[PDB]
Amino acid sequence: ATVNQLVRKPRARKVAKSNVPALEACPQKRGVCTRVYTTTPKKPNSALRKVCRVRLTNGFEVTSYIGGEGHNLQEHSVILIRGGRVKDLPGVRYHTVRGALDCSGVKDRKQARSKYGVKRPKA
């Protein structure tokens, strides 16, 4: 409040920690994705959701949600991981990119081809 106090100790600012612990100024990353489990959602909802524990290239073990209906993802064949936070499973700060590197796109999808890596059908 008093300006003489502010001269001794100036105004502090919060660091504002990011929601993507990978960091490195990277929009996307890749990782090994060793094991793919099926964990139940939070309290309000009820489902079985496809989730994978992605070992990143930098050396951090993390988890990531798999969007789209069904997948071939398991064991080996390194895939792209864009990130971004959506809240369903306990502690899931990332999302996998469908239709990139070795990750299959969503089959028979027509709307929203940009998301999920679906190519335009010839007509």
């Binding site: 070992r55 290239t57 080996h76 390194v78």
Partner: protein
């Protein structure tokens, strides 16, 4: 990839052959990796199943040593040398680096 996984039509193997061994291979020449792997699948048996992961075009690399870090495997090459960045990873974590001049000495030891 989808067929081989769905082919079993069951959540697991019907018997106890589930125990398997993983290998990592990078050969300097492109002609070998496709050719010798076929011979490497000949030694495969029902009891113990062996599979190749991430066949390389040559040498060795960071993502290759990382590939052997996630799943325990032997890292072998028909002909390869260790990179400066490759030695740091292999020496730190516990792994095995073995290069073989001939395919016969390789086909024997994997067995």
């Amino acid at each position: 990839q989808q067929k081989s996984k769905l082919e079993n039509m069951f959540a697991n193997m019907t018997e106890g052959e589930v125990h398997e061994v993983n290998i990592v291979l990078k050969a300097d020449v492109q002609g070998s990796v496709e050719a010798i792997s076929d011979s490497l699948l000949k030694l495969s048996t029902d009891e113990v199943k062996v599979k190749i992961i991430g066949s390389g075009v040559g040498g060795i690399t960071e993502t290759d040593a990382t590939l052997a870090a996630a799943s325990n495997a032997i890292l072998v090459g028909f002909n390869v040398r260790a990179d400066a960045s490759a030695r740091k990873v292999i020496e730190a974590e516990s792994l095995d680096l073995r290069y073989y001049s001939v395919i016969y000495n390789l086909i024997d030891e994997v067995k």
